[PDB]
């Protein structure tokens, strides 16, 4: 299963990269949200609304990355 062992490295590369990307993107965005809140606590719910509004875009690729990596890990492999 030389063919198979490369697949369990492929899923690893895909989802490790997706992990770093998504994690750091959300970290940055949430950090800016946190300082915005600390400036204006009585805006906190609207800024949470906006944080969730945009955060959905940071996941656009990294989830697709899981979508294919895990698929290969469990439907192709």
What amino acid positions are annotated as catalytic residues? 59
Helices (H), the chain: 2-39, 44-58, 60-71
Q: What is the DSSP letter of 53?
A: H
Minimum CB separation of residue 47 from another protein in Å reads 12
Residue 18, Cβ density class (10 Å: 0-12 exposed, 13-18 middle, ≥19 buried): buried
Q: Specify whether the CB–CB gap between 35 and 41 falls below 8 A.
A: no
Q: Does 49 bind another protein (CB under 8 A)?
A: no
Q: Does 42 bind another protein (CB under 8 A)?
A: yes
42 binds, among a second copy, another protein, none (CB under 5 to 8 A by kind): another protein
Total site size for another protein, rule CB under 8 A: 5
User: What residues between 23 and 42 interact with a second copy by CB under 8 A?
Assistant: 23-41
Q: Does 6 bind a second copy (CB under 8 A)?
A: yes
């Amino acid at each position: 299963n030389l063919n198979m062992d490369l697949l369990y490295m492929a899923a690893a590369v895909m989802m490790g990269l997706a992990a770093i990307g998504a994690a750091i993107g959300i970290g940055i965005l949430g950090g800016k949200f946190l300082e915005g809140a600390a400036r204006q606590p009585d805006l906190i719910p609207l800024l949470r609304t906006q944080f969730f509004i945009v955060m959905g875009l940071v996941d656009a690729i990294p989830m697709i990355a899981v979508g294919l990596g895990l698929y290969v890990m469990f439907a192709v492999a």
